[PDB]
């Protein structure tokens, strides 16, 4: 550990933007659409769409862990604490060569294969007061989730029920104990944000996460169900996360696509409610892959040599 006190701000961390831009370029030479449409305006309202048609090679895009080592004239500083807001003065900081192996998983609503919370479930937010700022949840115990191009994902109803609890409890432990915690599905928006979207085998899965976010701080949902089955769908025409615009990928082909990932975290986003009675409603969120990266770099910060 480094014997000094420094400031950290994962919400304004620059490595996030440095990885994000990398992960995008890690996408332009691995997953290339058959056609990519992107807004093109002079400002005069009228906006032509810039079209691009390239080969559409079916590749089973399988993410490789990524390290981030400071070159020279530069040093990475890691924060150490069982519960770090990731936005303030860190006491147990410590210089490191490369950040832990991170598997740049691009997804929405659920953070897959990320890094678990050592102690307990932690939830960071650039401002919990602002019903506009994504709440990044960090699970201390991942929940396996298996998706298949066959059309769905299975999740443990047990583990997910617990998780919502040990999350619902960490929420009121920030918005007011004497406050009811509820979970509802997406409010609306793009398919990629409304469902738990992500990529598996180069196939863009779109799983309906209603059964994962319709939890009332009162009842249950395990009648005749051992596992939660999200009705997933693979799309060819998708909205790009790298930049405003659609993109069409070629249909599936491999006799079988399969994924078994660790739900290591979520991206929630409680609704304003305009100071109404203690009844905070949290819904799935994300779509801004940087929050993802953040959830992984929340305790890092590269700095110039002295």
């Amino acid at each position: 550990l480094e014997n000094v006190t420094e400031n950290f701000n994962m919400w304004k961390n620059n490595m996030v933007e440095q990885m994000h831009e990398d992960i995008i370029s890690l996408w332009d030479q691995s997953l290339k659409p058959c056609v990519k449409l992107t807004p093109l305006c002079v400002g005069a309202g009228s906006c032509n769409t810039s079209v691009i048609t390239q080969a559409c090679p079916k590749v089973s895009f399988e993410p490789i862990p990524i390290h981030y080592c400071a070159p020279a004239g530069f040093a990475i500083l890691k924060c150490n604490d069982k519960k770090f807001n990731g936005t303030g003065p860190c006491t147990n900081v410590s210089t490191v060569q490369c950040t832990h192996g991170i598997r740049p998983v691009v997804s929405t609503q659920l953070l897959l294969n990320g890094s678990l919370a050592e102690e307990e479930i932690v939830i960071r937010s650039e401002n919990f007061t602002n019903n506009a700022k994504t709440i990044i949840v960090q699970l201390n115990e991942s929940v396996v989730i298996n998706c298949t191009g066959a059309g769905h994902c299975n999740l443990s109803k047990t583990q997910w029920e617990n998780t919502l609890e040990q999350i619902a409890i960490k929420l009121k432990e920030q918005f007011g104990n004497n406050k009811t915690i509820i979970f509802n599905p997406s409010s609306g928006g793009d398919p990629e944000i409304v469902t738990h979207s992500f990529n598996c085998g180069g196939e863009f899965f779109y799983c309906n996460s209603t059964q994962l976010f319709t939890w009332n701080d009162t009842r249950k949902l395990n009648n005749t169900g051992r596992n939660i089955t999200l009705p997933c769908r693979i799309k060819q025409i998708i909205n790009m996360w790298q930049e405003v615009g659609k993109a069409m990928y070629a249909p599936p082909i491999r006799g079988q696509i399969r994924c078994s990932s660790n739900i290591t975290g979520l991206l929630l986003t409680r609704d304003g409610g305009k100071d109404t009675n203690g009844t905070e409603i949290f819904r799935p969120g994300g779509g801004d892959m940087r929050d993802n990266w953040r959830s992984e770099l929340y305790k890092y910060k590269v700095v110039k040599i002295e």
């Epitope: 550990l1 014997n3 000094v4 701000n9 003065p89 860190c90 900081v93 040599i305």
Partner: antibody
């Protein structure tokens, strides 16, 4: 761009305790930035209080046993936050408390020397006025 | 702890002047672990120079730092309106870091 946003002014009775907060907008993680707290009594110069560095906290001789300093990484709703707790307030605790941040990522930088450092970003300050 | 004694307590200057503020450390500081800050009335200090002579990003180059023996000095060339206020030196050579008593720079008349 780093903006440090401290909690608001407080008026506190002697013997009481208070916790002041600091939201570190632009700060990634306190794994890469140290927090140093500092205070300035009215018409006085500045005095070091304590720090959290690499998730390890500590306090200067004059304040040891009376002060707890903590930090937590957060995202979405909030940026990373550090806080300073002060116990048994007296009149000579009345002052402006500043939270302060310095990146520790680059060992060669010269902003820091084995845990003792210069302070590159400052909050607005929070006045704690101690009075009956 | 290291004591920093700052000199002078106040000085009066005009726009366009060159100004010198000095700080004597009670011990030698081989590493040059010294910093200078500006504070304007009502506001938080700002770091101007660190490691004795290094300019922080965004600070005008009319500011410079120097050292001789146990003395460290801030120089301000072409004194400007926004420069008036109070300046502090700080050692971070040894724990705990400590500040000078400060120097007030006001307008000559």
């Amino acid at each position: 761009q780093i903006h440090l946003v401290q909690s608001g002014t407080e008026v506190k009775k002697p013997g009481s305790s208070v916790t002041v907060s600091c939201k570190a907008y632009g700060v990634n993680t306190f794994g890469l930035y140290a927090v140093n707290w500092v205070r300035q009594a009215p018409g006085q110069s500045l005095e070091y209080i304590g720090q959290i560095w690499r998730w390890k906290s500590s306090a200067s001789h004059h304040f040891r046993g009376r002060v707890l300093i903590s930090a937590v990484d957060l995202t979405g709703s909030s940026p990373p936050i550090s806080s300073l707790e002060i116990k048994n307030l007296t009149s000579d605790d009345t002052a402006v408390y500043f939270c302060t941040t310095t990146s520790t990522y680059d060992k060669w930088s010269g902003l820091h020397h084995d845990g003792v450092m210069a302070f590159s970003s400052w909050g607005q300050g929070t006045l704690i006025s101690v009075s009956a | 702890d290291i004591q920093m004694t700052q000199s002078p307590s106040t000085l009066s200057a005009s726009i366009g002047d060159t100004v010198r503020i000095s700080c004597r450390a009670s011990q030698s500081i081989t590493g040059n672990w010294v910093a200078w800050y500006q504070q304007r009335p009502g506001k938080a200090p700002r770091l101007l120079i660190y490691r004795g002579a290094a300019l922080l990003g965004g600070v005008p180059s009319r500011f410079s730092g120097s050292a001789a023996g146990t003395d460290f000095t801030l120089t301000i060339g072409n004194l400007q309106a926004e420069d008036f206020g109070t300046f502090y030196c700080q050692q971070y050579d040894t724990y705990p870091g400590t500040f000078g008593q400060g120097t007030k720079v006001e307008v000559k008349r």
